[PDB]
Write a protein that binds this ligand. Structure first.
Ligand SMILES: CSC[C@@H]1C[C@@H]1C(=O)N1CCC[C@H](C(N)=O)C1
Ligand SMILES: [Zn+2]
Length: 140
């Protein structure tokens, strides 16, 4: 579990969004596993606006932050699960690391700010849904 809080926005994995998120919806994209809802109070996370390929992510299943190298956001095949059929997920970045069910929502950060959140796992890999292209998160 986990979310990004920027301005009056809450960014969460679409497959983990609560009833309250759907009742206060801003934007969602199933192909990216992202959902953004509106918040009453201002958030303080800064979104990275960069092309960094090294950062640090939080892994709840180990209670540890790990330094990782990760790929550029790409269309990657993700195996069928209880939340989606087998499909290509867009804007996804992979790293070698631990990720189990329960780790989605962990933040990946570089020197510029938040890069994205854990969205996939297994086979000794961890996948992060990028948010650096969502420039509107910084305004209105
Ligand atoms: C971090 S949960 C890891 C277990 C292996 C499972 C995994 O990768 N997915 C299950 C949850 C939905 C994900 C998606 N974004 O399509 C895919
Ligand atoms: Zn960066």
């Amino acid at each position: 579990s986990g979310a990004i809080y920027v301005g009056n926005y809450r960014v969460v994995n679409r497959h983990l969004a609560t009833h309250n998120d759907w009742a206060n919806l801003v934007w969602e994209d199933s192909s990216r596993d992202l959902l953004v809802s509106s918040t009453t109070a201002q958030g303080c996370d800064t979104i990275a606006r960069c092309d960094c390929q090294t950062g640090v992510y939080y892994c709840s299943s180990r209670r540890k932050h790990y330094p990782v190298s990760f790929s550029k956001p790409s269309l990657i095949f993700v195996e069928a699960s209880e939340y989606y059929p087998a499909r290509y997920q867009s804007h996804l970045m992979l790293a070698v690391g631990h990720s189990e069910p329960g780790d989605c929502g962990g933040i990946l950060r570089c020197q510029h700010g938040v890069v994205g959140i854990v969205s996939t796992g297994g086979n000794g890999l961890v996948g992060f849904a990028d948010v650096r292209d969502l420039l509107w998160l910084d305004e209105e």
